[PDB]
Nucleic acid binder design. Structure first.
Ligand SMILES: [Mg+2]
Ligand SMILES: [Mg+2]
Ligand SMILES: [Mg+2]
Ligand SMILES: [Mg+2]
Ligand SMILES: [Mg+2]
Ligand SMILES: [Mg+2]
Ligand SMILES: [Mg+2]
Ligand SMILES: [Mg+2]
Ligand SMILES: [Mg+2]
Ligand SMILES: [Mg+2]
Ligand SMILES: [Mg+2]
Ligand SMILES: [Mg+2]
Ligand SMILES: [Mg+2]
Ligand SMILES: [Mg+2]
Ligand SMILES: [Mg+2]
Ligand SMILES: [Mg+2]
Ligand SMILES: [Mg+2]
Ligand SMILES: [Mg+2]
Ligand SMILES: [Mg+2]
Ligand SMILES: [Mg+2]
Ligand SMILES: [Mg+2]
Ligand SMILES: [Mg+2]
Ligand SMILES: [Mg+2]
Ligand SMILES: [Mg+2]
Ligand SMILES: [Mg+2]
Ligand SMILES: [Mg+2]
Ligand SMILES: [Mg+2]
Ligand SMILES: [Mg+2]
Ligand SMILES: [Mg+2]
Ligand SMILES: [Mg+2]
Ligand SMILES: [Mg+2]
Ligand SMILES: [Mg+2]
Ligand SMILES: [Mg+2]
Ligand SMILES: [Mg+2]
Ligand SMILES: [Mg+2]
Ligand SMILES: [Mg+2]
Ligand SMILES: [Mg+2]
Ligand SMILES: [Mg+2]
Ligand SMILES: [Mg+2]
Ligand SMILES: [Mg+2]
Ligand SMILES: [Mg+2]
Ligand SMILES: [Mg+2]
Ligand SMILES: [Mg+2]
Ligand SMILES: [Mg+2]
Ligand SMILES: [Mg+2]
Ligand SMILES: [Mg+2]
Ligand SMILES: [Zn+2]
Lengths: 56, 159, 104, 205
RNA sequence: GUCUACGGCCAUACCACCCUGAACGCGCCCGAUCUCGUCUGAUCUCGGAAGCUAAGCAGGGUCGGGCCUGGUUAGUACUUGGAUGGGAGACCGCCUGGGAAUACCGGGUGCUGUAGGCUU
RNA sequence: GUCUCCGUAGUGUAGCGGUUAUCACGUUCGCCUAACACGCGAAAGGUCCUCGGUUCGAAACCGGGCGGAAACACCA
RNA sequence: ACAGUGCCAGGUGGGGAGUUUGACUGGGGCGGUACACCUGUCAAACGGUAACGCAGGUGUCCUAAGGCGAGCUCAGGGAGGACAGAAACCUCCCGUGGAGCAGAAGGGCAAAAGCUCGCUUGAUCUUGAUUUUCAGUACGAAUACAGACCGUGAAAGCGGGGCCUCACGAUCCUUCUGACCUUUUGGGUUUUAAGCAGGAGGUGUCAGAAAAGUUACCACAGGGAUAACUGGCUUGUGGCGGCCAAGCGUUCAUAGCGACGUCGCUUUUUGAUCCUUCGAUGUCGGCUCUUCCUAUCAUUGUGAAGCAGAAUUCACCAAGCG
RNA sequence: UUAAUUAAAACAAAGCAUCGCGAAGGCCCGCGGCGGGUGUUGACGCGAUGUGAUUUCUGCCCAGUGCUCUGAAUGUCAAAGUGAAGAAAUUCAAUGAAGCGCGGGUAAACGGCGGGAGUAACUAUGACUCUCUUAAGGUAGCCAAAUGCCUCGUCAUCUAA
RNA sequence: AGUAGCUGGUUCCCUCCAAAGUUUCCCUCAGGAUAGCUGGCGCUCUCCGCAGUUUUAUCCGGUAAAGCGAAUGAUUAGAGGUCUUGGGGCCGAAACGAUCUCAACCUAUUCUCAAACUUUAAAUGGGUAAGAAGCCCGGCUCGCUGGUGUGGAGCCGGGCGUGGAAUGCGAGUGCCUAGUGGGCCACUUUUGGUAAGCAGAACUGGCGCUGCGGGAUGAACCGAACGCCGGGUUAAGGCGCC
């Protein structure tokens, strides 16, 4: 026999039982997906930071 | 059912405004976008490269990556009962600096100035905003003029 | 679809762009001693009838054309397979198009 | 031949014109919208009555054709074949479909064009008659008789505009004298205090 | 007052017609040896400096079209939320808030950045 | 009603995207015969059903109409 | 020395064996494909959103219709010029795109994304990230980069296919390409074979079984999720009845009728739907028997006629009796 | 003849007509053999079909599907065998049983057996003609037949109907 | 003891929490897997964070309405021009000569329209921001960028608490997990259909799972949600008699 096809009825009621939570936020966000050429230099910058340790 | 086409339903969304077609003004390419910038995404049909998907049209996100032509934007997207932080690569024709924070950055400097100034005068000045309060008592002068009497007008069939 | 019989493209052995001869790729004839064909022969022997599916419901009407490229560099002569999209008609080095000509 | 007009009385569907998507629509019953002395100048017929719809409904092109005949015949009998000008003010653009049964049933039920109707709003004029002032009673009777060809409720209203123009009759005469209005056949053109001053020279010479 | 080069916004800058343009500019303009390109030195490229604001260009004008911006349209049309409101219905009124668009009427007609000129 | 298919000189009919629109009968002219018929030599004649479209070019290819002809319409 | 027999091999083989004989679906079948995709609309101004909803397209096409650069400007119109005419080619003028951009549509595009030339193969090699569908899986398609090699241009740059939104395919197997590659079992050489990475051969029921019927001789498990009676909602169709009044009726709209229109009622027609019943409500018609309705054919009492009489027609109270 | 819903028009039948076979055979059984049935048989026989007494007749079609007949003349064609290459596995080649293809026969084998237009001195028909057309284009008969939808066909008879 | 995605059954009490009929994939449509919805076990903190809400800023949109003397498409009526074309005429020796006359054309008007039209353009709505993960200073690293000690990013040290709108509220996080995956109804919006107690969607709320007062009666209407009681008062509804 034929049956119902589609509905979103009752769906926003379900979504809100445990809340529509926003994504979690951390002060440090991962560098995944940033420009590879830019990231290569940022690692070189971090690597030699200890050179200027005495001046600081 | 509907199709899963990428640009379905964008007949008006991506079209150019009335009598605003043709060349893209070059100040669109001179804007400087840094990491951490808030930008409003607005797809533009004139440029078909780096187009944001329709769901990201009219949303505002944060820039996390800058390439030669595009930026990476972390923009929230609600899918059923969850909100995902989505990372999209959009060409800089389809974004614009958001003014949503400028009112805030204006207030901080005004706040930081007033906070500093009031401190060296030994006074307290309000820094937090407030909702508009109820109007306070005042006098309304008649000026020796009786208020104009108003009456409802008779019905008229102006058919 | 009409493809030239030569193209200067990247050669992986040389590591640089080189002229290549272009031909069509043809499936080779099956070996009787490929493990899959050997296993098939053993499973098909004796009784039981057919032991593997035989595909009937063909739907595609064309194939993807695979170009066989060969580096003309005498010392390299490397080869590579390059597939292009589906087409009902394919030829190599056919007559090039002309514009503003009378169509007799 | 057609279903009774109760089956299509109400504006239940979005407007469905005869277009490149709706093809095969039969011609409407009403093809003439103006009869009588159409050529009378603006000044010969100052009086104008209306038949105004009091309902939001669909009027079939057959009812518009019938009413036009009913209203026109009376005017010819009581005012002469040249004492009036009638204008039907509704055009049957909305197409009505039929799902013709004898059997699939409701499978593939989208119907074929059956006819055309005019969608009329509350307070919208259905048809208008302009004539001389002394024929006021003959206009009202002509429109009263034409109310019986329509479903729903209509109101006969004698307009305060001059003829078929948009300008009030109590000031139309002055506006023509001052040359703010220029007779242009059945109607009048409005002359603003704008544009090239050579137009003003032409009118005033 | 203003122009030239390069611009930003992209008609308040456009379109049509008319008037006026000092100086410097920008031009029209005069040639084809060279560079360069054409059926054609018209265009493009190159070498110039007799003439002219005729034109482009700039400024101004038009009860000008457009465009920009107000008024009216109008607290109208539409609309969020409410009722055991009306009405056979179609639909409508009221309560609580938001609130348009023509026609019609008025006003305006580029601003401005960098650099370099002219203008006692 | 669903499905399939067809419209070309007066008649019946071919047309393998560029034809001087095929074939036969028919019609007109001239010979032959005293005359008809048969026979021989010539000629004319297609709204390629209609509208629209792609195509360098549509009778043909693709959609919509206008006529027409087949095949189905079963279990109660 | 063949018949024949034993064992292999090819053919034949519904005589016999086993098995299959899609799905959606206003019942099923027939018909379609709403089964994998794409455009506009529905869709209620974020996105999403259904029906065998509406209007359409898809399984291709392209050595250029890809890439770069330059130069040009299109549809249409006006006015002129031998043959030349509605339409050939030449010239000037207007021209915001009314053209073209392979195709469906929508968007986009004017010293260009179109047209014409010159040179070319960024439609090449390579690792990750991201987007779309989404479960935030796969595929497909697409977006930013990064590393090589290149093309083009004076250069800035642009280009890793087609201006954008579609144009497509797992595992197993086979086939090709790649390495001074690994393994090929006690060691060594060599053929072979298997591995590793990337293409192709295909599943269109398109996340991908290998598949014809008939049963009225039929079977089982179920189904009122689902058809064939009644009943229920609805009333298009059927039936019956009004309203307006152009006409008919010699005359005269309405004695009696009545077009074009329009408003209803009924459930004694047929439909539409699938709510009840498939651990069964006995399926047509007649016969017989009772009862009820009135939308009245007759009869009682009446009103009106184009009611002289007779006959007839229209209407009223009216279902007692036929 | 369907025991227990069908007694019949169904089945059988004589008659008729086909088909195989001369015994190392036809047809059939059987896991098996110097096996078995027909067969204690021999073509006036046995085996396999169709039709269905008598009477009269049994038309055309071999294109289709079957069946059947001819075959080195001869395309495809397995194993084995032969030849060559190689270290061998292996690869290649030549050769070519039946069967299929190729060609005949056959319908009392399964089956099949058209369409359009014009035309006779009133009208109607249209013997006649032109044309497209298949392997034949339904012949002798017979019919609203147990076979005709339209259909309760049309005419006549049978009835008051 | 064949298999059964199918029918039937499935045994004590109280207490606490409490669904789904929806997404995607499946020879998937009476069934599964999958996400969602539930329960249980906790644990990490607390006595800043968050929110089915508004406020203030800031973006997004093309529906309702409107418009068509604005583009596309459809559509009615006249009016003025008219040789730039035609039909009727009409005087001729006849031509663009004359004469009219009706159409096509052009110019200003005019009636009426659009789900697959649009210059305009709401309400309701969708993002974002409203601080210490901030702000402001000084320095250091870089193979990235580069006229420039330029830019950009990172890192180190230092100073600033009026914790920078309202209101409310303790939060975060992890494992394991059942049933469900036939729904149906109403206000409003809405597709097909003559319509249907018909079929199909959006939003919210219901019934399903739920009693109770009222609507005589009734899954869904109106009021209101439930431990066992006494008193008071009410809602929606009522007050001739029952
Ligand atoms: Mg379901
Ligand atoms: Mg074997
Ligand atoms: Mg509707
Ligand atoms: Mg001067
Ligand atoms: Mg010159
Ligand atoms: Mg001048
Ligand atoms: Mg103006
Ligand atoms: Mg200026
Ligand atoms: Mg067999
Ligand atoms: Mg079998
Ligand atoms: Mg099925
Ligand atoms: Mg919405
Ligand atoms: Mg260019
Ligand atoms: Mg690169
Ligand atoms: Mg291109
Ligand atoms: Mg497998
Ligand atoms: Mg060994
Ligand atoms: Mg049977
Ligand atoms: Mg049967
Ligand atoms: Mg029934
Ligand atoms: Mg009826
Ligand atoms: Mg009369
Ligand atoms: Mg049911
Ligand atoms: Mg139902
Ligand atoms: Mg029972
Ligand atoms: Mg009973
Ligand atoms: Mg009665
Ligand atoms: Mg018996
Ligand atoms: Mg018996
Ligand atoms: Mg026989
Ligand atoms: Mg034969
Ligand atoms: Mg026969
Ligand atoms: Mg016969
Ligand atoms: Mg058992
Ligand atoms: Mg099942
Ligand atoms: Mg499958
Ligand atoms: Mg069940
Ligand atoms: Mg929309
Ligand atoms: Mg509207
Ligand atoms: Mg429903
Ligand atoms: Mg339940
Ligand atoms: Mg609950
Ligand atoms: Mg309850
Ligand atoms: Mg009640
Ligand atoms: Mg109490
Ligand atoms: Mg009571
Ligand atoms: Zn090489």
């Amino acid at each position: 026999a034929k049956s119902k096809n589609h509905t979103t009825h009752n769906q926003s009621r379900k979504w809100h039982r445990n809340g529509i939570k926003k994504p979690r936020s951390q002060r440090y966000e991962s560098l995944k997906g940033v420009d590879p050429k830019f990231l290569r230099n940022m690692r070189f910058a971090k690597k030699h930071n200890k050179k200027g340790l005495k001046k600081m | 059912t509907n199709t899963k086409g990428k640009r379905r339903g964008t007949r008006y969304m991506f079209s150019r405004p009335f009598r605003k077609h043709g060349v893209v003004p070059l100040a669109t390419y001179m804007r400087i976008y840094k990491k951490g910038d808030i930008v409003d995404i607005k797809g533009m049909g004139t440029v078909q490269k780096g187009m944001p998907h329709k769901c990201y049209h009219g949303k505002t996100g944060r820039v996390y990556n800058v390439t030669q032509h595009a930026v990476g934007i972390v923009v929230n997207k609600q899918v059923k009962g969850k909100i995902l932080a989505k990372r999209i690569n959009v060409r800089i024709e389809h974004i614009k600096h958001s003014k949503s924070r400028d009112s805030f950055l204006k207030r901080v400097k005004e706040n930081d100035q007033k906070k500093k100034e009031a401190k060296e005068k030994g006074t307290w000045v309000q820094l937090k905003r407030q909702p508009a309060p109820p109007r306070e008592a005042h006098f309304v002068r008649t000026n020796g003029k009786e208020p104009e009497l108003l009456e409802p007008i008779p019905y008229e069939f102006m058919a | 679809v009409n493809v030239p019989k030569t193209r200067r493209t990247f050669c992986k052995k040389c590591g640089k762009h080189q002229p290549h001869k272009v031909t069509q790729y043809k499936k080779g004839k099956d070996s009787l001693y490929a493990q899959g064909k050997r296993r098939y022969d053993r499973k098909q022997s004796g009784y039981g009838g057919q032991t593997k599916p035989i595909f009937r419901k063909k739907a595609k009407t064309t194939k993807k054309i695979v170009l066989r490229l060969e580096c003309v560099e005498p010392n390299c002569r490397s080869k590579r397979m390059l597939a292009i999209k589906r087409c009902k008609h394919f030829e190599l080095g056919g007559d090039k198009k002309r514009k503003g000509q009378v169509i007799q | 031949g057609r279903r009774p007009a109760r089956c299509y009385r109400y504006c239940k569907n979005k407007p469905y014109p005869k277009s490149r998507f709706c093809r095969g629509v039969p011609d409407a019953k009403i093809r003439i919208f103006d009869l009588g002395r159409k050529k009378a100048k603006v000044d010969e017929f100052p009086l104008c009555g209306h038949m105004v719809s009091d309902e939001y409904e669909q009027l079939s092109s057959e009812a518009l054709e019938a009413a036009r005949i009913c209203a026109n015949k009376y005017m010819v009998k009581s005012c002469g074949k040249d004492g009036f000008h009638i204008r039907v003010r509704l055009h049957p653009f909305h197409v009505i479909r039929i799902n013709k049964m004898l059997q699939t049933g409701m499978r593939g039920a989208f119907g074929k064009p059956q006819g055309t109707v005019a969608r009329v709003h509350i307070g919208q004029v259905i048809m208008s008659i302009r004539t001389k002032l002394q024929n006021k009673e003959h206009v009202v009777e002509a429109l009263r008789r034409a109310k019986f060809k329509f479903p729903g409720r209509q109101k006969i209203h004698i307009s305060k505009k001059w003829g078929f123009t948009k300008f009030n009759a109590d000031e139309f005469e002055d506006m023509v004298a001052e040359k703010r209005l220029i007779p242009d056949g059945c109607g009048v053109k409005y002359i603003p205090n704008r544009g090239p001053l050579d137009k003003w020279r032409a009118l005033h010479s």
